[PDB]
Each structure stands twice: as structure tokens, then as C-alpha cells.
Amino acid sequence: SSDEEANLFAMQLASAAVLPMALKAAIELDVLEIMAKSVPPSGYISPAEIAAQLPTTNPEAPVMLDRVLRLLASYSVVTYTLRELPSGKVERLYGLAPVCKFLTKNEDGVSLAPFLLLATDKVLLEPWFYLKDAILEGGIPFNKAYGMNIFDYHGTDHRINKVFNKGMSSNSTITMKKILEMYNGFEGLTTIVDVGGGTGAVASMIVAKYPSINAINFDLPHVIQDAPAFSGVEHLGGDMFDGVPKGDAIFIKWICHDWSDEHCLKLLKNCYAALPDHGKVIVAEYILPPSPDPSIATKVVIHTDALMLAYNPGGKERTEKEFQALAMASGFRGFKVASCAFNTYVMEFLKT
Amino acid sequence: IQIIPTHSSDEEANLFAMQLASAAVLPMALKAAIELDVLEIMAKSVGYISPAEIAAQLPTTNPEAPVMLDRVLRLLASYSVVTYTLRERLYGLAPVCKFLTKNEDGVSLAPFLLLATDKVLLEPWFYLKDAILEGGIPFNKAYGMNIFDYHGTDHRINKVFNKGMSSNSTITMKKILEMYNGFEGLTTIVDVGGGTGAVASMIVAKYPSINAINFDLPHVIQDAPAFSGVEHLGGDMFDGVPKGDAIFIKWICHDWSDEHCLKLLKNCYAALPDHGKVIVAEYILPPSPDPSIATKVVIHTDALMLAYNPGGKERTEKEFQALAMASGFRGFKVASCAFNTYVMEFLKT
Numbered sequence: 161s162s163d164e165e166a167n168l169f170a171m172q173l174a175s176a177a178v179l180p181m182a183l184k185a186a187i188e189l190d191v192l193e194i195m196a197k198s199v200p201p202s203g204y205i206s207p208a209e210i211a212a213q214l215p216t217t218n219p220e221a222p223v224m225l226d227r228v229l230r231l232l233a234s235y236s237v238v239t240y241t242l243r244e245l246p247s248g249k250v251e252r253l254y255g256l257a258p259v260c261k262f263l264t265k266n267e268d269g270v271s272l273a274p275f276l277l278l279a280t281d282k283v284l285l286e287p288w289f290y291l292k293d294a295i296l297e298g299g300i301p302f303n304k305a306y307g308m309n310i311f312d313y314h315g316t317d318h319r320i321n322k323v324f325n326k327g328m329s330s331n332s333t334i335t336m337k338k339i340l341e342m343y344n345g346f347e348g349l350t351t352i353v354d355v356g357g358g359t360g361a362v363a364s365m366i367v368a369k370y371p372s373i374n375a376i377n378f379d380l381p382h383v384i385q386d387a388p389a390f391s392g393v394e395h396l397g398g399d400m401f402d403g404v405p406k407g408d409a410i411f412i413k414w415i416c417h418d419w420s421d422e423h424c425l426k427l428l429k430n431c432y433a434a435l436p437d438h439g440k441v442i443v444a445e446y447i448l449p450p451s452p453d454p455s456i457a458t459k460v461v462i463h464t465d466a467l468m469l470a471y472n473p474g475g476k477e478r479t480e481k482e483f484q485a486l487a488m489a490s491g492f493r494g495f496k497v498a499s500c501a502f503n504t505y506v507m508e509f510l511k512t
Numbered sequence: 513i514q515i516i517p518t519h520s521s522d523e524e525a526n527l528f529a530m531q532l533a534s535a536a537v538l539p540m541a542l543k544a545a546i547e548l549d550v551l552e553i554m555a556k557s558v559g560y561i562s563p564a565e566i567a568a569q570l571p572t573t574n575p576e577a578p579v580m581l582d583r584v585l586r587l588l589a590s591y592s593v594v595t596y597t598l599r600e601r602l603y604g605l606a607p608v609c610k611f612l613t614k615n616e617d618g619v620s621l622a623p624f625l626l627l628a629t630d631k632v633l634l635e636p637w638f639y640l641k642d643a644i645l646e647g648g649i650p651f652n653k654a655y656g657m658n659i660f661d662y663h664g665t666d667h668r669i670n671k672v673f674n675k676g677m678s679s680n681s682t683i684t685m686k687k688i689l690e691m692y693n694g695f696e697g698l699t700t701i702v703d704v705g706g707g708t709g710a711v712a713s714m715i716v717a718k719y720p721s722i723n724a725i726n727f728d729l730p731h732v733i734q735d736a737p738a739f740s741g742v743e744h745l746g747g748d749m750f751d752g753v754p755k756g757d758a759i760f761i762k763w764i765c766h767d768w769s770d771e772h773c774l775k776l777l778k779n780c781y782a783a784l785p786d787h788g789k790v791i792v793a794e795y796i797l798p799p800s801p802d803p804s805i806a807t808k809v810v811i812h813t814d815a816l817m818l819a820y821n822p823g824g825k826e827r828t829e830k831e832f833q834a835l836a837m838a839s840g841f842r843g844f845k846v847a848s849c850a851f852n853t854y855v856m857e858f859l860k861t
């Protein structure tokens with residue numbers, strides 16, 4: 161009677177992978193860009209007209225698209241309306257929902273679509289089959305699936321390396337654009353370094369904003385190899401646990417959550433060493449809320465903890481106090497919560 | 513209501529996109545928890561239990577087991593799969609766990625979830641783009657054969673598929689039997705695509721002077737337990753169907769195109785006496801893609817069929833009557849309803 165409601169929830173959980181994978185298909189097919197591009201504002205189009213812009217002849221593609229688009233419409237990833245024919249046949253039409261703004265290329269050409277592709281990638285789904293073992297036997301699920309850690313593995317699978325760095329790059333641009341309009345911590349620096357900065361998108365944004373500043377974008381060689389040339393950006397291949405380039409300030413975004421506290425200590429000590437006396441580590445990370453609340457912002461940080469649990473070299477999301485404890489543990493004397501964009505807080509560990 | 517767009521309206525859209533990116537975390541986490549027996553352990557103990565206390569009940573050699581459990585449970589908790597209280601987090605079962613733990617007759621929906629989240633059934637999603645662009649079925653593109661054919665060659669997935677269906681049907685049919693009266697009267701009932709025979713065995717338990725025929729493909733009948741009053745028969749339903757006073761098809765139509773369903777239903781019509789009936793137990797497509805849980809369940813399952821089956825889809829009440837009529841049946845009724853599973857009757861009135 162509501163036993164009914166528990167049963168259905170159970171059914172929904174079971175098949176819940178359908179939504180991401182289906183959406184993954186729609187993005188791969190470019191079926192959102194196609195909508196953004198053809199459609200009147202607040203207007204929507206039909207699966208038949210969408211199919212017409214696909215490289216296909218498959219009398220079935222309209223029907224298949226309609227079925228996909230329906231599922232996304234029930235979860236508000238796309239809008240919809242029903243148009244009843246005199247016979248009573250109902251035609252469905254779909255439009256752009258607010259989330260589409262971030263799943264279709266913006267002015268600048270950026271979205272979160274590549275990130276979705278990363279997080280739905282075939283490579284990242286294997287690890288889940290090993291989580292049960294990892295809880296029993298110790299180890300890390302990714303390491304059990306493949307013969308190595310994630311980043312090593314990135315240095316062997318060139319497809320996933322490009323998908324990962326693009327995924328990271330897209331996400332970070334959207335966010336750094338926002339951090340850069342509120343946070344002022346990069347003021348009065350001559351050298352900035354980005355430790356684990358990927359293909360250097362974040363560094364290029366820092367320099368575009370403060371031309372005087374010399375960026376060093378630092379990451380693993382297989383990542384650096386795939387880095388565009390940026391005016392003001394020196395790329396450097398290296399390993400952060402062996403040391404880190406010298407600069408007035410250091411930036412780590414999405415680095416600490418990848419590793420154990422013991423690894424962050426090592427990194428952080430390396431950062432302390434690499435800094436002048438009044439220098440600092442700018443830390444860009446999610447912050448774990450104090451409870452399992454149902455909000456989107458919270459499910460996101462919690463989702464990523466789980467990601468980290470499956471792909472981890474001992475990664476985890478952390479509270480503010482935990483970050484404070486990492487700062488203290490590594491010789492930092494001051495701590496600042498300076499801003500936040502899309503669940504990414506910007507913390508400063510100061511050595512004052 | 514028109515919402516202007518601001519930082520708040522944008523931040524929410526950014527966060528929703530992130531949540532979609534990784535939404536697969538939920539059923540995979542849930543899976544791992546069911547695999548470790550984590551829910552069942554909870555079911556039988558203290559009403560809140562710490563991750564440490566659960567771990568002490570697991571054959572583990574991993575000192576980080578409790579912490580790892582906490583991280584998975586926090587994610588479940590977040591979605592109301594499990595409940596929590598604070599000291600540390602202690603965890604309790606949420607109402608949904610009523611159907612995810614072997615509860616009463618040793619039955620739950622846990623084995624269905626294990627079917628749905630199984631490697632074999634996830635692969636076909638990487639082929640969906642292909643099928644659409646190039647034609648075909650995502651599953652066949654992954655495995656070189658249709659899904660029922662594949663079960664016949666993978667013994668592991670065959671057991672996992674039959675178990676999933678058997679334990680799902682067992683819950684639903686129990687409710688159908690309390691509700692629906694159309695089995696009463698019949699002297700012979702045949703279940704076409706009945707699987708392991710759970711449903712047939714249920715029918716005879718309730719109506720011991722009924723003869724039941726459980727009909728399915730040879731490879732599935734071979735794993736079917738002996739039941740009082742149930743005759744198991746292996747065959748292909750498209751070649752024909754054993755004779756009965758009434759035919760039951762639970763979760764069959766939705767596996768196939770209109771064409772395939774028309775052959776089936778025609779076989780059923782020919783297997784029946786002049787007043788015979790086909791009893792059809794299927795979801796029915798609601799009118800809109802509304803956000804309720806019930807509707808998501810049928811829409812989820814419509815998309816599943818897209819990935820795995822030959823022309824299978826969900827259908828409106830009208831499309832069902834259309835199949836009924838196109839197949840000789842003159843009468844049509846929507847009899848009852850359990851857990852969004854409608855029982856329709858195609859009558860040769």
C-alpha cells in the first residue's frame with residue numbers, strides 16, 4: 161500500500177544505471193548539441209528531426225531516440241510536451257532543461273559533457289566488480305581489475321588518458337572561471353605553480369587573468385605530453401612525491417582527495433619545502449558535510465568519495481577540520497576558507 | 513513559474529550535471545553491499561549498528577574494512593536506502609530494505625538487483641550509440657547473439673537471470689494471487705515463458721486441483737526444480753504453445769516487437785478452447801514521463817528493453833488491446849494490479 165512504494169523504489173534502484181548510460185549514449189550521439197542548435201528558445205523538437213541530423217539511415221533511430229529522450233525527460237535532464245493526435249496517438253517533443261546549459265558547449269565552447277564521458281567510461285566501471293573483494297581482502301578495486309594504479313594505467317591506455325584530461329580540463333575551466341571572479345589570492349604573486357595541474361587549463365586561466373604572473377603547470381609526463389602551449393605557462397613533467405617546482409604560491413585542485421593522508425603529508429611537506437617563508441598552498445577541494453543529507457551538493461561530494469574508494473590510492477573526501485589537520489601536520493601555521501564554486505572550496509594553507 | 517538565472521540557479525544546474533555523471537555509483541555501491549551480505553547482517557542485529565560491528569561479522573582480513581563500509585553506507589544513507597543516527601555513524605535499514613533482504617519465504621529483490629547490475633548486462637550500454645546509428649540491438653552487438661541465446665551458453669548468467677526473475681515474480685505473484693481471481697475455475701493453466709517455474713508452482717500451491725504447465729526454452733527448463741502439480745516443457749513459443757484452459761504470460765510481450773507478439777498471441781489463441789483466455793501481466797506506459805517512482809520503473813524498464821531485447825518496449829493500454837484484437841481476441845479487460853504490474857485478460861469472448 162506503501163509496501164508498494166518500497167518495492168518500486170527497490171526496482172528503481174536495481175536498474176538505476178540506465179540514466180547515466182542512456183545519457184552517455186545521447187551525448188556521444190551529439191543529441192544535445194543538436195537540440196541547442198535547432199530549436200526555438202523555450203521551444204522543443206521532435207526525435208524525428210533530431211535523427212535527421214545524425215549520420216545514419218536506420219528507420220528505427222527516431223523511435224530509439226524518443227525512448228532515450230523519454231527516460232531523460234522523466235528525470236528532468238530534458239524538458240518535454242505531449243501532443244495528442246486526433247486518433248489519440250501521442251507524439252512526444254523535447255527541449256533543453258536548465259542542466260543542459262552545462263551539458264552543451266557554452267560561449268567559449270565548454271561543457272561538463274566530457275566529464276560525464278569520463279565518469280561513465282567503460283574503464284571506470286570495471287573497478288566496481290572488485291569492491292567486494294577489496295573490502296574482504298584489502299587492496300584497491302581499480303588495482304585489482306587492472307594491473308596497476310589509475311595513473312600508471314593512464315600512462316598505458318592513451319584513450320583513457322585523453323578522456324580523463326579532457327574530462328578534468330572541461331570541469332576545471334567551468335569552475336576556475338567562477339573562482340577567478342570571487343577569489344583574490346593570486347594577487348601580488350610573481351610565480352604560481354599548479355601541482356597536478358593536468359593539461360594546464362587552470363594555469364592558462366590564472367595567466368590570462370594576471371599577465372605578470374609566471375605559471376608552472378606540473379604533472380606526470382604522459383599528461384604533460386598532451387598539453388597545449390600556453391602563453392605564460394611552462395609545462396613540467398615530474399612526480400609530486402619526489403618534489404615540486406619552486407614558486408611564491410602553489411595550487412592543488414583535486415589532488416588531496418585522490419590520496420591517503422600519508423600521501424598528502426608527503427605532498428604537503430614537498431609543498432612547504434618548495435615555498436618561500438611567507439608563501440602558501442592554495443587547496444581546491446570539495447568539503448564533506450557532517451551528515452548523509454539528501455541534497456544534490458552533498459550527493460555530489462559523497463558520490464566522489466565513493467569514486468575515490470573504488471579508484472583510490474587512498475583517496476577520500478575530507479571535513480574542514482581534517483584539512484586543517486593536514487595543514488598543521490605539514491608545518492603550516494595558518495588556514496583560510498577563501499571561497500567556493502560548485503561545491504569546490506578554495507582553502508589557503510599559509511606558512512606565516 | 514519563471515526562474516531568472518542567477519548563481520544559485522546555475523550552481524544547482526552544475527551540481528545536477530555532476531550527480532548525473534556519477535549516478536552509477538549508487539547501484540554499484542548497493543550491489544557491493546548486497547554481495548557482502550551487508551543488508552542481511554544488519555537485518556539480524558541490535559536498532560542501529562556501526563560499520564565496525566558489521567565488519568566483525570564479515571570474513572575479512574582488511575583492517576580498513578569498517579571505514580570502507582562507512583563510506584559505502586553513507587552513500588546509501590544519502591539516498592534513503594539505509595538510515596543513520598550520530599554519536600561516528602550508526603546505520604539502520606530503511607523501508608526499502610524490506611524488499612532487499614531475504615525476508616519471509618527466503619525471498620527478496622536482492623537477486624534481481626544482482627542481475628541488473630551484472631557485468632554481462634552492463635556491457636550492452638557501450639554499444640547503444642552503435643545500434644542507433646548502424647541499426648540492430650546493443651546486446652547482440654556486444655555478444656554476437658540475442659540475450660536468450662546467450663543465457664544458453666553462459667551458465668553463470670543463466671542462473672543469475674533465472675534467480676532474478678524467480679525472486680521478482682515470487683514477490684509480485686503473491687500479491688496478484690491475493691488480488692486477482694481469474695485463476696479460479698481453470699482446470700489447466702499454462703505459463704508461457706514461465707522460467708524456473710516459480711509462478712506455476714505458486715498457482716498450484718493456491719489451487720491444488722489445477723494442472724500447471726511451465727513452458728520455456730530447453731536450457732532454462734533444465735534448471736527448473738520439481739514441483740507438485742507442475743509439468744515442465746521445453747520448446748520455442750514461436751513454433752507453438754501447449755494447450756490449456758488459459759495461458760499466462762508474465763513479462764513476455766515486453767521482450768518483443770509487435771510482429772513477434774502477434775505470432776505468440778496467435779499461437780495462444782490456437783492453443784485455447786472457444787472461451788479461453790490469455791492472462792497478460794505487464795507494466796503499462798503512463799501518459800507522461802512524470803517524475804514519480806512508479807513511472808520511472810516502467811520507463812527504466814522500457815530503456816532496458818532497448819538495450820537487450822529484439823524489438824521489446826513498453827506499451828499503453830491501447831497498444832495491448834490492439835495486439836489482442838489483431839490476434840483474434842474479441843474481449844479485453846484490465847483485471848487487477850500489483851506493484852505496477854497489471855493483469856490484463858485477452859478474451860475469446
Ligand SMILES: Nc1ncnc2c1ncn2[C@@H]1O[C@H](CSCC[C@H](N)C(=O)O)[C@@H](O)[C@H]1O
Pocket residue numbers: 311328329332355356357358359362378379380383398399400401412413414415418
Ligand atoms: N605523483 C604525481 N605527480 C604529479 N602529478 C600527479 C601525480 N599523481 C597524479 N597526478 C596528477 O594529478 C591529477 C589528478 S586530477 C586533477 C586535475 C585537476 N583539474 C588539476 O589540474 O589539478 C591528474 O592530472 C594526475 O596526472
Ligand SMILES: Nc1ncnc2c1ncn2[C@@H]1O[C@H](CSCC[C@H](N)C(=O)O)[C@@H](O)[C@H]1O
Pocket residue numbers: 660677678681703704705706707708711727728729732747748749750761762763764767
Ligand atoms: N522463444 C521462446 N520460447 C519460450 N520461452 C522463451 C522464448 N524466448 C524467451 N523465453 C523465456 O521468456 C522469459 C522472459 S523473462 C520472464 C520470466 C517471468 N517471471 C515469467 O514467468 O514469465 C525467459 O524465461 C525466457 O527464457
Ligand SMILES: COc1cc(/C=C/CO)ccc1O
Pocket residue numbers: 278279310417418419467468469470471472473474475
Ligand atoms: C583515487 O582514484 C582516482 C579516481 C579518479 C577518477 C576521476 C573520474 O571521476 C581520478 C583520480 C584518482 O586518484
Ligand SMILES: COc1cc(/C=C/CO)ccc1O
Pocket residue numbers: 174175624627628629633659673767816820821
Ligand atoms: C537480462 O534481460 C532482461 C532483464 C530484465 C531486467 C534487468 C535488470 O533490471 C528484464 C527482462 C530481461 O529479458
